[PDB]
From a paper:
[name] class I molecules are present on the surface of all nucleated cells and are one of two primary classes of molecules encoded by the major histocompatibility complex (MHC), the other being [name] class II. Their function is to display peptide fragments of varying length from within the cell for outward immunosurveillance by T cells and natural killer (NK) cells, allowing the immune system to differentiate healthy from diseased tissue. A putative archaic [name] class I allele of particular interest is [name]-B∗73:01 (B∗73:01). Further distinguishing B∗73:01 is that it is one of only two of the [name]-B classes that encodes the C1 NK cell-binding epitope formed by residues V76 and N80 in the α1 helix. Our results demonstrate that B∗73:01, an archaic allele that was likely reintroduced to the human population through introgression, presents a restricted repertoire of unusually long peptides with a preference for arginine at P2 and a hydrophobic residue at the C terminal position.
Second, we were able to solve the crystal structure of B∗73:01 in complex with [name], loaded with a 10mer peptide, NRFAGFGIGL ([name]), to 2.9 Å resolution. Our complex shows the general binding mode of [name] onto B∗73:01 is grossly similar to that seen for other KIR complex structures published to date. That is, the KIR binds directly over the F pocket of the heavy chain, making no contact with [name] with the D1 domain generally making contacts with the α 1 helix of B∗73:01 and the D2 with the α 2 helix of the antigen binding region. Interestingly, however, when compared to other [name]/KIR2D complex structures (including [name]/C∗07:02, KIR2DL3/C∗03:04, and KIR2DS2/A∗11:01 (16, 45)) the docking angle of [name] onto B∗73:01 is shifted ∼15° toward the α 2 helix. A contact map and buried surface area analysis of the intermolecular contacts between [name] and B∗73:01 compared with those of the complexes of [name]- C∗07:02 and C∗03:04 with [name], show that the D1 domain of [name] uses considerably fewer contacts (6 VDW and 1 h-bond) to engage the α 1 helix of B∗73:01 than with the α 1 helices of [name]-C∗07:02 (14 VDW, 3 h-bond, and 1 salt bridge) and C∗03:04 (11 VDW, 2 h-bond, and 2 salt bridge). In contrast, the contacts between the D2 domain of [name] and the α 2 helix of B∗73:01 have slightly more VDW contacts, and share the same number of h-bonds and salt bridges as with the complexes with C∗07:02 and C∗03:04. Together, this results in an overall smaller footprint surface area for B∗73:01 skewed toward the a2 helix, likely contributing to the “tilt” of [name] on B∗73:01 relative to these other complexes. A close-up view of the buried surface area between the KIR and presented peptide backbones shows that Q71 of [name] has a direct h-bond contact with the main chain nitrogen of P9 of the [name] peptide, either a result, or cause of, the skewed KIR binding.
Author numbering:
A (entry chain B): 2 to 100
B (entry chain E): 1 to 10
C (entry chain A): 1 to 221, 223 to 276
D (entry chain C): 1 to 204
Write the structure that this text describes.
Amino acid sequence: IQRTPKIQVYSRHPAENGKSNFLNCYVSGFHPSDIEVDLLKNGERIEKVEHSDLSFSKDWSFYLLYYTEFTPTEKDEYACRVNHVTLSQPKIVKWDRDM
Amino acid sequence: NRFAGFGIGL
Amino acid sequence: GSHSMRYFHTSVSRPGRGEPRFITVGYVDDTQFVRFDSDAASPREEPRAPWIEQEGPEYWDRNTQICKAKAQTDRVGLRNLRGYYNQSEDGSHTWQTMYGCDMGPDGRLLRGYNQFAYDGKDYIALNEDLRSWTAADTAAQITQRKWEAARVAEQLRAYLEGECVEWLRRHLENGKETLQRADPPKTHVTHHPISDHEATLRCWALGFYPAEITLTWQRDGDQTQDTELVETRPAGDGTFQKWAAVVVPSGQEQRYTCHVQHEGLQEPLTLRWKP
Amino acid sequence: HEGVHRKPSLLAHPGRLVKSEETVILQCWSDVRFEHFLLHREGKFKDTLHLIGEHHDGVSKANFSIGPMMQDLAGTYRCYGSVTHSPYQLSAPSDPLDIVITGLYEKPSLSAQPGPTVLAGESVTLSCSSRSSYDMYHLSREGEAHECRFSAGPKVNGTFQADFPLGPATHGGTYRCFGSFRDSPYEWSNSSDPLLVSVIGNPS
Ligand SMILES: *[C@@H]1O[C@H](CO)[C@@H](O)[C@H](O)[C@H]1NC(C)=O
Ligand SMILES: *[C@@H]1O[C@H](CO)[C@@H](O)[C@H](O)[C@H]1NC(C)=O
């Protein structure tokens, strides 16, 4: 039994340009647990990213929250890169303020 | 407290 | 209402890298308070909630030796499963295990459970009566025949209706401010035009706890289809987020109503998009 | 010249029947000056230990402490000796010694047929019963050892049992019985109650 991860890239607080916030990339509903998750800023990797402790749901699928401090602007483009065994190519999900 | 766990395996 | 304590464990084998990785975590109703990492410098049960840090070294020392022995149990167990399913050493495999107790307002046990899973598929689970098991395949009935032969469920039941509920109320009192508190959600609807003849309304719910929430859209009376229900996200500060969107044409922007239900939102809510 | 040195000897002290959490000592001795001893366990948890050789009374031995007995330590052990160490010029393997772990499962029932007191010459068959679905049973007479292994069957009243025909009753003895499962032949249950078989003369 293998399961594709569900990716959600969002902010902890409503994004206001010029205010410090936390960028969240929440992966869930995947199996097995080995996952690669990166946070991207204009195409460059963010190193100071922290993630929660590995836990799973009732259907045994794992979930993980990756978070880091950031201040959004108008032109700075953010994204999350997720790599999993179920994925042929690594999935990249850009950030949206309305999502 | 956690479960002491049964020493027997599967 | 129906509060619960839950311990989760994950053991993944790493062939070319030696011993298996063991991550275990403890939850009291959607909040985590303990963790233990096999790949830590000094692997020990460390606090992950501010209200558990007051426990004396007896709690930490005793519970550290617990999952220390549990990691060895899973290392032996993962290895055995490879022979049960006729698998070689070169592959990585997962062994998930989860036990805990559900407690109701009657102040005592409501449901006890101890479930196991191999490679994401079910293996064996403690039944509701706390005395029998349920195997998922012929390879799992073997351990059932061993666990019945060892009276394993008897030691399970003593813990589930006993120390599990006892250490549940002890937790719910020492951390009552952060555990027995319900944060109502902040709700609002947003408007996103996708065309000259279409637009999307998105119902939001922010900063709520616990994560259990219902959020559906209704048009003049209950379209669960064509509604984009998103999974409950963790905010990061102990609260949760969720939203569902629905596509409408230009005009008739009203008569589309969103409904929210929660435990901090006491009377049920109804709201629409205001320009 | 020396070629392969002959086999060393291997014993289990106090014995190969180790209870759970107990510790057994696996001695490895020979009259050959083995400066190095290697203990090896085959199966699913293969492992090798190295202890130096202590020489006294022109014998060379090594006391391998197995540690708190768990299921991953059960199996057949073999022993090797070596005089050099730059590489190990290992000797022939010792005789295999099957180390089992006991006390993991419910003890079975040891019944005697035609009964516990039998008359000389009569055939005697011991039965190892249990409501636990053990795949096989192990029976041994006091001291005589040589544990016999038979398989089981799901009887009508819910028991799984094995019959051990013993032949003409001679002097009797005290017998013990253990249960185990197919995939784990070295993981035995709690020992059954010791059954005493007494013999008397044939009436005339
Ligand atoms: C043998 O066992 C004894 C304990 O009975 C121990 O003191 C000793 O170190 C072991 N080894 C040798 C070579 O005597
Ligand atoms: C085996 O015997 C010991 C000692 O009598 C006892 O503590 C243990 O519970 C027994 N185990 C089983 C499975 O009967």
